[PDB]
Design a protein around this ligand. Structure first.
Ligand SMILES: OC[C@H]1O[C@H](O[C@H]2[C@H](O)[C@@H](O)[C@@H](O)O[C@@H]2CO)[C@H](O)[C@@H](O)[C@@H]1O
Length: 382
């Protein structure tokens, strides 16, 4: 009864699900996938190996599902935080760059893709949220979160608003939650403590309460998502937004005269955005691991490869030492680094998936009023 009702009963996955002799790459739709496809086409021109870049919706949830059956892309791009879960499930190949190649990338970026002593992805770029502001509406961005309500009252009189950003993904609210003490998992003595979650302490509660108060006082709307905030800022309807380097391209196209700067402080403390390392993992069921290695090491992670992607959508602070130096001049990147400094590198442990889902629910429910801050964060905690 037990076996025969389960899909696992005498189950052997089919062969040839992932096509040998080509590369399929998944990357998020807010990244420079058209630029990545340019690198892929160069690879095809040189080597005859076709590269297909796709940007599926919710790829970070689709990948573990399809890869578990030996299907999916040869290469998956995502922030490093999801990869430990993939690795634990046996979905990622350990990557084997030689010492010469490892020397080309910053050591801390290799650390972000290390799991149980193994490298499980290639690091590409360091991402951190910054405060983005309309210099025409706001020549001087606020130093503190606390002064934003007063700013909104000013701009509401002019038919504008102070601030809009994605409230549907907890990634964007985390800088405020972590500012005065909130944390995900406590890193102590070489390991994250999965029983030590800091989403319901005094600091986290204070931060989320300030967010909820902004909404209660009609300075923000609870259902604002990525597209709503991006559209509003790039139309010049709101003075500020919170976003990463990938967003700069659309603002460059917009008519907005904008700047990128340090996130405001909360209770005198710097906002602490979670830092992500955009990373490329190789599917453990791929028959093309040698092709993937060649593409990633000798085509993408070069000055020419990163330039192609960066020209589509800015990567931020790239992990490649040689190319990072060329872009260090950019004040937007400098601001990105400053915020990344003040923040924390995301854990990559398998528990991150559940953590993000819990905090997503908590932030959405607190913001919309489905739950109080105390109720919401209590649930998020273990
Ligand atoms: O909001 C939870 C979400 O946060 C992070 O995702 C970021 C990603 O790192 C960025 O590159 C960009 O695409 O925005 C995303 C948020 O919408 C985590 O990496 C992710 O695992 C988590 O679910």
């Amino acid at each position: 009864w037990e076996k025969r009702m389960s899909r696992s009963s005498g189950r052997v996955y089919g062969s040839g699900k992932i096509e040998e002799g080509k590369l399929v790459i998944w990357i998020n739709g807010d990244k420079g996938y058209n630029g990545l496809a340019e690198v892929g086409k160069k690879f095809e021109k040189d080597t005859g190996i076709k590269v297909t870049v796709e940007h599926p919706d919710k790829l970070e949830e689709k990948f573990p599902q399809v890869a578990a059956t030996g299907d999916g892309p040869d290469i998956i791009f995502w922030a490093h935080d999801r990869f430990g879960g993939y690795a634990q499930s046996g979905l990622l190949a350990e990557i084997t760059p030689d010492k010469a190649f490892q020397d080309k990338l910053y050591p801390f970026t290799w650390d972000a893709v290390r799991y149980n002593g193994k490298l499980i992805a290639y690091p590409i770029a360091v991402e951190a949220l910054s405060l983005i502001y309309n210099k025409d509406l706001l020549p001087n961005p606020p130093k503190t979160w606390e002064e934003i309500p007063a700013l909104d009252k000013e701009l509401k009189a002019k038919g504008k608003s102070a601030l809009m950003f994605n409230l549907q993904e907890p990634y964007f609210t985390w800088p405020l939650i972590a500012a005065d003490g909130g944390y995900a998992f406590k890193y102590e003595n070489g390991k994250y403590d999965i029983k030590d979650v800091g989403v319901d302490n005094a600091g986290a509660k204070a931060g989320l309460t300030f967010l909820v108060d902004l909404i209660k006082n009609k300075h923000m709307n609870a259902d604002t998502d990525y597209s709503i905030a991006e559209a509003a800022f790039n139309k010049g309807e709101t003075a500020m937004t919170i976003n990463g380097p990938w967003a700069w391209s659309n603002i460059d196209t917009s008519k907005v005269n904008y700047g990128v700067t340090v996130l405001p402080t909360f209770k005198g403390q710097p906002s602490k955005p979670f830092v992500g390392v955009l990373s490329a993992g190789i599917n453990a069921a791929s028959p093309n691991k040698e092709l993937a290695k060649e593409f990633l090491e000798n085509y993408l992670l070069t000055d020419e490869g990163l330039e192609a992607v960066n020209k589509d959508k800015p990567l931020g602070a790239v992990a490649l030492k040689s190319y990072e130096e060329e872009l260090a001049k950019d004040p937007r990147i400098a601001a990105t680094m400053e915020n990344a400094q003040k923040g924390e590198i995301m854990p990559n442990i398998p528990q991150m998936s559940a953590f993000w889902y819990a905090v997503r629910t908590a932030v959405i429910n607190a913001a919309s009023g489905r739950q109080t801050v105390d109720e919401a964060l209590k649930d998020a905690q273990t």
